[PDB]
């Protein structure tokens, strides 16, 4: 009974350079519940990340949100790195502002 996390990275508002926003990493459909979730800016850990919105779906899989305040620029790269027992390697999903 092991399920691999689905990792989604997105901003609250459409990204505009210079304009304050919120970056989200929603990690979903996983089991067991032990998990590490790190948000990255230019390959470096973002401090003071908030964890919220923990729940489970009808099949009992875990859901949880990591989020942080940010102001985008053209050159800054953002990502979310997740470690979970279901994955041989740590998995990184990158923010795609054109998505």
């Amino acid at each position: 009974i092991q399920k691999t996390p689905q990792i989604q990275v997105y901003s609250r508002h459409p990204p505009e350079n210079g304009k304050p926003n919120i970056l989200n990493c929603y990690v979903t459909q996983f089991h067991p519940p032990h998990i590490e979730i790190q948000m990255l800016k230019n390959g470096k850990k973002i401090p003071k990340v908030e964890m919220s919105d923990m729940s489970f779906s009808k099949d009992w899989s875990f859901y949880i949100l990591a989020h942080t305040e940010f102001t985008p620029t053209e050159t800054d790269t953002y990502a979310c790195r997740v470690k979970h027992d279901s994955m041989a390697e740590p998995k990184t999903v990158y923010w795609d502002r054109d998505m």
């Binding site: 609250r12 067991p32 519940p33 919105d53 009992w60």
Partner: protein, 275 residues
């Protein structure tokens, strides 16, 4: 419309690394409002919405004590279940509970629930009658028997019909400006090239509350099913939600396809095309 009070409860063993981690997270509708976490620096119930800051110290003390009591009960449960399933003392295991009640727009109970899982599978649940249990396996039958001899269903029923409803009403009252609000979706469509003269059109809905939303793609008044991708509706970090739905269409025929967005906060549904 109708409204819900839900608690998500999790206890997770960690042999060799101290006591289990124990967490309770509470929601009114789609809004996180309270939380208890045993690994916090000073484990106590805490508000997760500004409207809960109005509740006085007696609320917080009473909930915190209930939570420390629950932590100890689930700690015992984890041990008990190793015995029921003949499991080793060296593995990690998880108990989950969803517990709460839904009232209709008239303030009366629509339904109450108490569902348990062990290691991610149905274990035991209270039936819709609020009187009898349904047990998923032979281990849960022991719990069922214990709970019938103890009159557990009657105690749980009293909570679901009385306490749960009454506190839901209070919470809706105290946080009505936040909880009874309606935030309308804002929509846009993005375009992405693919191999072989195909393109992805992705329809975005942003900034909405409550979470319940429906997005559909049309072609000629016809809701598409094939080549559709979507994500589960997801929180955006400020108490609002977002969602997207995409369709793969042939290059040059983008103008035929329309995205339709349906939400409680819209006076009329939104229709939009690639631009």
């Amino acid at each position: 419309g109708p409204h819900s009070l839900r608690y998500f409860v999790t206890a997770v063993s960690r042999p060799g690394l101290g006591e289990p981690r124990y967490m309770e997270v509470g929601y009114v509708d789609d809004t996180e409002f309270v939380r208890f976490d045993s690994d916090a620096e000073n484990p106590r119930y805490e508000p997760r919405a500004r409207w809960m800051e109005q509740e006085g110290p007696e609320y917080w003390e009473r909930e915190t004590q209930k939570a420390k009591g629950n932590e100890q009960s689930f700690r015992v449960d984890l041990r008990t279940l190793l015995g029921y399933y003949n499991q080793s003392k060296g593995g990690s295991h998880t108990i989950q509970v969803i517990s709460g009640c839904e009232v209709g727009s008239d303030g009366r109970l629509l339904r109450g629930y108490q569902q348990y899982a062990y290691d991610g599978c149905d274990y035991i649940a209270l039936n819709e009658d609020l009187k009898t249990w349904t047990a998923a396996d032979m281990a849960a039958l022991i719990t069922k028997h214990k709970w019938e001899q103890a009159g557990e269903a009657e105690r749980l029923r009293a909570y679901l019909e009385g306490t749960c409803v009454e506190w839901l009403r209070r919470y809706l009252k105290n946080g009505n400006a936040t909880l009874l609000r309606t935030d309308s979706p804002k929509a846009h469509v993005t375009h992405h090239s693919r191999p072989e003269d195909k393109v992805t059109l992705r329809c975005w809905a942003l900034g909405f509350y409550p979470a319940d939303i429906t997005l559909t793609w049309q072609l000629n008044g016809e809701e598409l099913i094939q080549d559709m991708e979507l994500v589960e509706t997801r929180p955006a970090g400020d108490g609002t939600f977002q969602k997207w739905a995409s369709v793969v269409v042939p290059l040059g025929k983008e103008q035929y396809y329309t995205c339709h967005v349906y939400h409680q906060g819209l006076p009329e549904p939104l229709t939009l095309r690639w631009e």
